Amino acid sequence: SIADIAFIDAAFTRTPEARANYLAVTRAALEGRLALFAARLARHSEAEVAATIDPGFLLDILDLLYSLPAALREALPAEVQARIALFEAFLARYADHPNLALVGRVFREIQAIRAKYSGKLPDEYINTLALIRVDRARLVRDMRLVEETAVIVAAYALAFDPPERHPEAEARMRATIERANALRRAAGFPPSLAPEEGLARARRLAARLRALRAAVRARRLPTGVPLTPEQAAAILATLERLYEVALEIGRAIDAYLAAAEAYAATAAELEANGASLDPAARAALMEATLRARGAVIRERAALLRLLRRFYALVLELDFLLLRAYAEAGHDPDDPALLALLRELDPFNGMTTSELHRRRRRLRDLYIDLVAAMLRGVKNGELTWEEVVAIMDGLLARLADPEVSEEEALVGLLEEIVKDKKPIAEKALKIAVDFVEANPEFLRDGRAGLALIRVVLEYALDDPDAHKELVAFAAAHLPRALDAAVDEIRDLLNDVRILFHSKPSPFLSAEEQKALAKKKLKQVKEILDLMKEIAELAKKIKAKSKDPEVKALMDAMLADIQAAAKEIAKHLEELLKDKELAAAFPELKTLLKLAKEIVKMLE
C-alpha cells in the first residue's frame, strides 16, 4: 500500500518532512479503513460479519492504529474515535471466533500491554510494543507463505538440477523451515510445518515435473498423448521460465528471512531492555527497530510480485497441456489431464495460507473455463485464432499485479459469452456454480458486477427461459454492489492521499499523478458497469411477462439507486477539497455519471 512506501521513506530518510508525510498518510489511510469497517458492520449482523470479514483487513486497521503516535490517535475527530470504539468492541466480542482468532490474540496482547504499562512508561514506547504484537501476527501468516514457497523452490531444484546438487537443495529447504519455526517460537507460537512433511511434498512434485520434461523431450505427455514439435518447444520454454522464477523466489525468501530475523532481534532487545535504558538509548533502539521493520516490508513486497509471476506461468503451462489434449482429439476435461494438472499443483496439501488457498481455487475455475472454450473450438463455435487472441490477453492481464486474478478470469467469461455462442451456456454454469460454492469471490466488486452483467446480457434474449440465472443475479447483486462501493471509497481516498502526499524517491510525482489517473479510471469503469446493469434490468423487466421476475428487477434497480447515491455522497465530500477537485477534473465527470444513475431510477 501507499502507507508502506511512506513508512519506508520515513524510517530511512529521517527528515521532519518524511515523518510529516508518513503521519498524514497513515492518518488518512486509517480514516478510510475505519469508514469501510463501519459500513461492513452496518450491512449485516455482528455474527455474519465475524464469520465473513477478511481477518487481514482487521490486522491492517491495528497496524495503522498503532503506527500513529498515541497522541495523534487520541486527537482524532469524534466520528473516527466513535469508529475506533466500535472496532475495538467488535474485536473484544469475537476474539475467539475461528475466523478472527489471530487478530483476537493480537487485540488481547495490546489490551494487556496497556493494562500493565500505561502511565508508568512513555506512551510511544507502549505504541512500539503494540506495533510489535501486530507485526508478530503478520510473521505467523508470512511464515505460512514461506513454508509453502520453500516446497516449490526445492521441487524445481530437485527436478531440473543435476543430481550432485540435490543434498544442497535439501539443506536449504530444511534450513528455511527451521528458520521459520525459530521465528514462530520467538513471536510465541508452536511450529506449523515439519521439515519432512515438506521435503516429501517437494519430492513428489519434483518426480512429476521430471516426468513431464522427460516425456515432452520424447514428443509426448506422461499420459501418452502425442505432442506437435512446436507445442513441445512451448512447454519446455514455459518449464525453463518456471525454473528461473523459482530461483528468483528462493533468493527473495532468503532476503525476507534475513530482514525478519533482524526485526525479531531488535524487537526482542527493545522488549528486554527498553524499560531500563535512558531516553536517548531507548529512542535509538526504537529507530533501529523501525528501520528493520521497513526492510521486512520491502522484502515481502518483492517476494509477492515474483509469486504473482510464478502463478501466471503456472496457468500458462496449464493452458499448454489442455490445448495439447484437444489437438489430439481428446476432450480437454478428460479425467487423465485433470489428474496430471492436480499432480502438478504447486499449492496442494499446504492449506495454511490465504493467498495460495484462493489461487488454488481460481486455478480450478480457470482450467474449467479454458476447457469450455477449447471444447468450443472443436464444435466450430470458436476458431483457434480466436482462442489464441483471448489467451494472450488473459495471460498478460494475469502477469500484471495491478489486475485482480478474479477480474482476469471474469474477462475470460466475457470473451466466451460475447457472441452468445452455444458454449456460453456451459461457461456461465461453471461460473455461477463456483460463486455459489465460493462466496468470497464477491469480495471483489468489479469482478462480481461484471459477472452479473454477463448473466443479464445472456438472459436478455429470453428472460423467462433462464429464470434461474436471473434469480442468481438478483440474489448476488447486493453483495457485489457493497464490494463495489467499498472499492470506489478505497480508490477515491487513495487518490486524495496521492495528491496531498509528497514526491518520494519511491513514488515520483509522475508515478503519483499516473497512479491517481488509473484509480479514477477504475472508478469510472465501475460506475459504467452499474449503469449497464440497470439498462439491462430495465430491458429485462419490459420484455418479461412474468410478474415476480419484474419484482426482482425493481429490487435490483432499488439496490443500484442506493449504491449510486451513497457513491455521489463520497464524491461530494471529496469535492469540498477544492485544491483536489482542481487537480483532477475527472472527479466532476464521475459525480455527473453517479447522479445520472440516481435519475434514470427516480
Distance CA 558, CA 533 (A): 12
Q: State the distance between the two ends of the chain, measured CA to CA, in whole angstroms.
A: 38
Q: How large is the angle between the packed helices 166-187 and 229-273, nearest 10 degrees?
A: 40
- Residue 329 identity (one-letter amino acid): G
Closest CA to 180 of 143, 151, 153: 143
The shares of helix, strand and coil residues in the chain, as percent rounded to the nearest 5, are: 80, 0, 15
Cα separation, 143 vs 296, whole angstroms: 13
Residue found under cell 519506508: 8
**8 A C-beta contact, residue 449 and residue 526:** yes
Cα 143 to chain centroid distance, Å, stands at 18
Query: Residues 594, 512: contact at Cβ < 8 Å?
Result: no
Here the cell at position 397 is 492481464
Read off φ and ψ for residue 71, nearest 5 degrees: -55, -50
**Residue 193 in grid coordinates:** 510445518
In the numeric block, the cell 477480474 is attached to 407
CA-angle at 93, arms to 89 and 94, nearest 5°: 120
Q: What are phi and psi of 235, to 5 degrees?
A: -65, -45
User: How many Å separate Cα 594 from the centre of its chain?
Assistant: 27
Full DSSP string of 65-93: HTTS-HHHHTTS-HHHHHHHHHHHHHHHH
Distance CA 350, CA 378 (A): 37
Q: Which residues, other chains included, contact 271 with Cβ-Cβ below 8 Å and sequence gap of 6+?
A: 129, 132
Q: How many CA atoms lie within 13 Å of 94's alpha carbon, on the beta-carbon side? A: 22
How many CB atoms sit inside 10 A of residue 379's CB? 11
User: Going by C-beta distance under 8 Å and a sequence separation of 6 or more, which residues neighbour residue 489?
Assistant: 32, 35, 36, 39, 570
Which residues have a Cβ under 8 Å from the Cβ of 27 and sit 6 or more positions away?
Answer: 68, 72, 76
User: Which amino acid, 508?
Assistant: S
**Nearest alpha-carbon partner for 141 in 180, 104, 91:** 180
List the one residue out of 114, 105, 115, 173 whose CA is nearest residue 141. Answer: 105
Cα distance between residue 128 and residue 117, in whole Å: 12
Alpha-carbon distance of 70 to 349, in angstroms, equals 43
Name the E strands within 22-69.
Answer: none
The HSE-up count of residue 286 (CA atoms within 13 Å, CB side) is 21
For residue 197 the three cell numbers come to 512433511
Residue 481 near residue 443, CB atoms below 8 Å: no
**Residue 71: exposure state from Cβ atoms within 10 A (0-12, 13-18, ≥19):** exposed
DSSP states of 351-395: TT-HHHHHHHHHHHHHHHHHHHHHHHHHTTSS-HHHHHHHHHHHH
Which residues, in sequence order, are CB contacts of 446 under 8 Å at separation 6+? 404, 407, 484, 487, 522, 525, 526, 529
Separation CA 591–CA 587 (nearest Å): 6
C-alpha to C-alpha distance for 465 and 67, rounded to whole angstroms = 56
- b/e map 150-165, b = 16+ CB within 10 Å: bbbbbbbbbbbeeeee
Distance, CA of 482 to CA of 486 (rounded, Å): 6
Distances (CA, A) of 328 to 184, 194, 243, 337, 602: 50, 42, 27, 12, 57
DSSP element (H, E) containing 76: none
Give φ, ψ of 95 to 5 degrees: -60, -25
Rounded distance, CA 348 to CA 356, Å? 9
Extract the C-alpha cell encoding 404: 485482480
Q: Which amino acid is present at 414?
A: E
Longest Cα–Cα distance of the chain, Å, equals 80
User: What φ, ψ does residue 220 adopt, rounded to 5°?
Assistant: -140, 170
Residue 218 dihedral angles phi and psi, to the nearest 5°: -95, 20
Cell numbers given for 232: 513441445
Structure solved via: X-ray
What's the gap between Cα 146 and its chain centre? 17
